[PDB]
């Protein structure tokens, strides 16, 4: 259900996700990639080998580009806990703020026990633009992820 709409042109959430993984790229100097001198580092096997150790998703994403088109069914991975299941009630045409690379980002930092199903609790374009509806739909429903987008696309 998480079909985040691709943009004609480049998807802007592919771009800002990919540079996040390169923030954990700790060069041997101890100082992070800062300024326009971040393009010219002789990054040998000494420095990429902790990057695949620190970042789990660059180790995860290679196991789904290879082992899903090639269709090896014996694979002992979990795809229920990588991408959650979008549970909205039917009948209501509802697009979300968050596309699939974003909901694969927030789902990584949750507890592991909850990562399989994201159910709709409140949304401003379906349940009104009221705080009395917000406080009535999200009270007493367990742990939930509030996510909002202002006028400046933040």
């Amino acid at each position: 259900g998480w079909t985040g709409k691709e943009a004609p042109g480049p998807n802007p959430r592919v771009q800002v996700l990919a540079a996040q993984l390169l923030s954990d790229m700790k060069l041997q100097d101890g100082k992070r990639l800062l300024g326009p001198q971040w393009l010219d580092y002789d990054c040998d096997r000494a420095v990429i080998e902790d990057w695949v150790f620190r970042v789990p998703h660059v180790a995860i994403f290679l196991s789904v580009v290879i082992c899903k088109g090639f269709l090896v069914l014996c694979s002992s991975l979990d795809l229920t806990t990588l991408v959650p299941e979008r549970q909205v009630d039917q009948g209501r045409g509802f697009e979300s703020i968050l596309d699939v690379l974003s909901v694969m980002y927030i789902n990584a930092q949750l507890p592991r026990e909850q990562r399989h199903r994201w159910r709709l609790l409140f949304s401003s374009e379906l349940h009104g633009h009221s705080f009395s509806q917000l406080c009535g739909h999200i009270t007493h429903r367990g742990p939930c992820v509030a996510v909002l987008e202002d006028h400046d696309k933040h």
């Binding site: 374009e125 379906l126 009104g128 009221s130 509806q133």
Partner: protein
Amino acid sequence: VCLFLNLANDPTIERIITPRLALTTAEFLAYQCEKHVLVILTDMSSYAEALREVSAAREEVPGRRGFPGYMYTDLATIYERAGRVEGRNGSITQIPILTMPNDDITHPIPDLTGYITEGQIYVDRQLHNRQIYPPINVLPSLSRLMKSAIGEGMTRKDHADVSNQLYACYAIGKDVQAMKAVVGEEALTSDDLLYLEFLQKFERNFIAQGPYENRTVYETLDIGWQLLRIFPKEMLKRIPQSTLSEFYPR
């Protein structure tokens, strides 16, 4: 603007002939000079205090509550000099302004001016005591000719459905706060507080105006439409779907 002032220290007979100067000027500007005239007759209750004072001088008979017998045909001598005519391109609109004594609507000046005219506005006291301007009570206010003033060609095609939906979510909101004071605060469900979020935002964004803020009709409905988005789409049942699918989502 022509301004016919008439003070309280001025004689009592000049107050009788004042609303017949203001209409003879109006029946000239619209039915001979082809203008759209609006007549404002401030404190028409003091007209009926002078018409009682003139008639008592002639030792005449008093009718209901001291006012003369001929007061129903003497208020209609003023009010029925209005309306559009055939042939001329002018019209006269009248807004008389009264004072109900001790807030009793059953007084003969409001009871007989509601027999000849076509609505009320009801400036309310309970909205003035909570510092709202203009304190207009929309629950007893009416205009019997609203259907021939709005719609396509006049204002916009969503006017007749925004208006009687705001009137329904202000009517329910006045019931919730009337009932929540008598039964208690913990009986409100989550849909029930929503008719109180409207009621507070209706009295601050729609009824509160400020005495020099001139809104056109296109920015009263665009104020009114962002107040109907407080509710979800399934709860607006006074509004049809063919106009909900054009104006509601933003």
